[PDB]
Ligand binder design. Structure first.
Ligand SMILES: *[C@@H]1O[C@H](CO)[C@@H](O[C@@H]2O[C@H](CO)[C@@H](O[C@@H]3O[C@H](CO)[C@@H](O)[C@H](O)[C@@H]3O)[C@H](O)[C@H]2NC(C)=O)[C@H](O)[C@H]1NC(C)=O
Ligand SMILES: *[C@@H]1O[C@H](CO)[C@@H](O[C@@H]2O[C@H](CO)[C@@H](O[C@@H]3O[C@H](CO)[C@@H](O)[C@H](O)[C@@H]3O)[C@H](O)[C@H]2NC(C)=O)[C@H](O)[C@H]1NC(C)=O
Ligand SMILES: *[C@@H]1O[C@H](CO)[C@@H](O[C@@H]2O[C@H](CO)[C@@H](O[C@@H]3O[C@H](CO)[C@@H](O)[C@H](O)[C@@H]3O)[C@H](O)[C@H]2NC(C)=O)[C@H](O)[C@H]1NC(C)=O
Ligand SMILES: *[C@@H]1O[C@H](CO)[C@@H](O[C@@H]2O[C@H](CO)[C@@H](O[C@@H]3O[C@H](CO)[C@@H](O)[C@H](O)[C@@H]3O)[C@H](O)[C@H]2NC(C)=O)[C@H](O)[C@H]1NC(C)=O
Ligand SMILES: OC[C@H]1O[C@H](O)[C@@H](O)[C@@H](O)[C@@H]1O
Ligand SMILES: OC[C@H]1O[C@H](O)[C@@H](O)[C@@H](O)[C@@H]1O
Lengths: 104, 104
């Protein structure tokens, strides 16, 4: 075990660690998380919340949220066509606060 | 258009911008990007590369890579069972360097 050897391996592990199941910030399209009837739009269409992702030690395991809170995010509801008026509505979208690899 | 009004809207747009199609760093499981025959493992199993994602202005559009480079990432190949020895191999994994919303 030379000294140059260690550093690289180290670094590779840090790589491996940064890929592990955690709540990472992601872009969620609000339509796909609700009923979305009769072409009631959103603007903006998407929102930045934290979500679970990343790899697991064993294959059968998956990154699943173990806890979740719900942020409120002001958005414009546009029903086009057509009317009248889009209003500033606070929609509740799931922020994942806990994760763990699980079955499945 | 009051002054408090502006700030919030501003901020919401910045939200909207941060969700738009771009190359964002993500965790790729190396098995799923190759042949993966006869249970030839990897360790670590995953790797941090840049990939395309995010929302698009219109619905029919998707974030697609328009350019891609290929990073080389030293990994351990373990064929278990079983032998012999896992060796430090440089695998070539796709780093997305360009994106744009497209059809589809
Ligand atoms: C893990 O996070 C997900 C979000 O990705 C959570 O799923 C959500 O769970 C809530 C609460 O059960 C669901 O709200 C429900 O919606 C139904 C019908 O759409 C409504 O009738 C109920 O009254 C309720 O409000 C929501 O649908 C669901 N969202 C999804 C899956 O898209 C889940 O709760 C989280 N799980 C853990 C372990 O915390
Ligand atoms: C949405 O979920 C994200 C992540 O799941 C939440 O961010 C997390 O907030 C918690 C709050 O306790 C942070 O815990 C602590 O953070 C401080 C930061 O200095 C740290 O010193 C402590 O050791 C501890 O970790 C956590 O770090 C943070 N995670 C990330 C990645 O930002 C966020 O709060 C959730 N949104 C809301 C408002 O519920
Ligand atoms: C967008 O990025 C993707 C990666 O997610 C690129 O897909 C990859 O394209 C390369 C080059 O065509 C493929 O390599 C090929 O593999 C086949 C068989 O597996 C081999 O026979 C060929 O000789 C070649 O080396 C690779 O399979 C493919 N990877 C995927 C899709 O998982 C794609 O090139 C990028 N597109 C743009 C617009 O740059
Ligand atoms: C893998 O792809 C990522 C992103 O697709 C590459 O990161 C990007 O690298 C380019 C190199 O030109 C950066 O462009 C310039 O970055 C400097 C940073 O100070 C900035 O001042 C310039 O305005 C310009 O944007 C780009 O920012 C950067 N993107 C991110 C999000 O990091 C990365 O280089 C690719 N891996 C390899 C080695 O091919
Ligand atoms: O319909 C009321 C309730 O139903 C369910 C989900 O689609 C929620 O978004 C919605 O608020
Ligand atoms: O089989 C050779 C070549 O085939 C294709 C892909 O699976 C590549 O990963 C591999 O290198």
């Amino acid at each position: 075990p030379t000294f140059y050897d260690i550093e690289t391996l180290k670094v590779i592990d840090e790589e491996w660690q940064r890929t592990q199941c955690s709540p990472r910030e992601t872009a969620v399209e609000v339509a796909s998380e609700l009923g979305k009837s009769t072409n009631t739009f959103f603007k903006p269409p998407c929102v930045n919340v934290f979500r679970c992702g990343g790899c697991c030690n064993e294959e059968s395991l998956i990154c699943m949220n173990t806890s979740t809170s719900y942020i409120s995010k002001q958005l414009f509801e546009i029903s086009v066509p057509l009317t009248s008026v889009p209003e500033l509505v606070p929609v509740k979208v799931a922020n994942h606060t806990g994760c763990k690899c699980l079955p499945t």
